Structure 1
């Protein structure tokens, strides 16, 4: 499923859940001034970390961090209970 506005959609979902808009903060930083920088951007709601994201830039990290949260809400985290293809019924 292709979504181009994860951060925008995340705000909509939080309102549906009666949850305030997230706050983006820089959790980790690596070689920012260099040509190969890594930033971890984690969205915070009420000072609680809803999700975290890695990115080449803060905007990409911020955008990706929204992607992680949307999965959480929808429970598509890869560590989810594996689909039960083996049910006899």
Structure 2
């Protein structure tokens, strides 16, 4: 009873599959808003 992910869709089946993808992105650290890749010269 705790929300892990939410997904939109044009059908309940499509929405559910998208919600699973959203959950996987969060679990693996590939969220759209993740820290960008650091291209700065190594220290």
How many residues in Structure 1 have an aligned counterpart in Structure 2? 43
Q: Tell me, which stretches of 5 or more residues in structure 1 are unaligned?
A: 1-46
- 1:65-86 superposed Cα distances (whole Å, 9 cap, x missing partner): 0000000000100110110012
Moved over 3 A (4+): none
Q: Give the TM-score of the pair, scaled to structure 1.
A: 0.46
CA distance in 2, matches of 1:48, 1:81: 25
Q: For the pair shown, which has the larger CA radius of gyration, 1 or 2?
A: 1
- 1:26-58 superposed Cα distances (whole Å, 9 cap, x missing partner): xxxxxxxxxxxxxxxxxxxxx000000000000
Q: Tell me, which stretches of 5 or more residues in structure 2 are unaligned?
A: none
CA distance in 1, matches of 2:16, 2:22: 10
Which has the larger strand fraction?
1
Match of 2:30 in 1: 76
Q: Equivalent residue of 2:17, what SS? A: helix
Question: How much is the aligned-residue C-alpha RMSD, in angstroms?
Answer: 1.1
State the 1:88 CA deviation.
3.5
Which has the larger helix fraction?
2
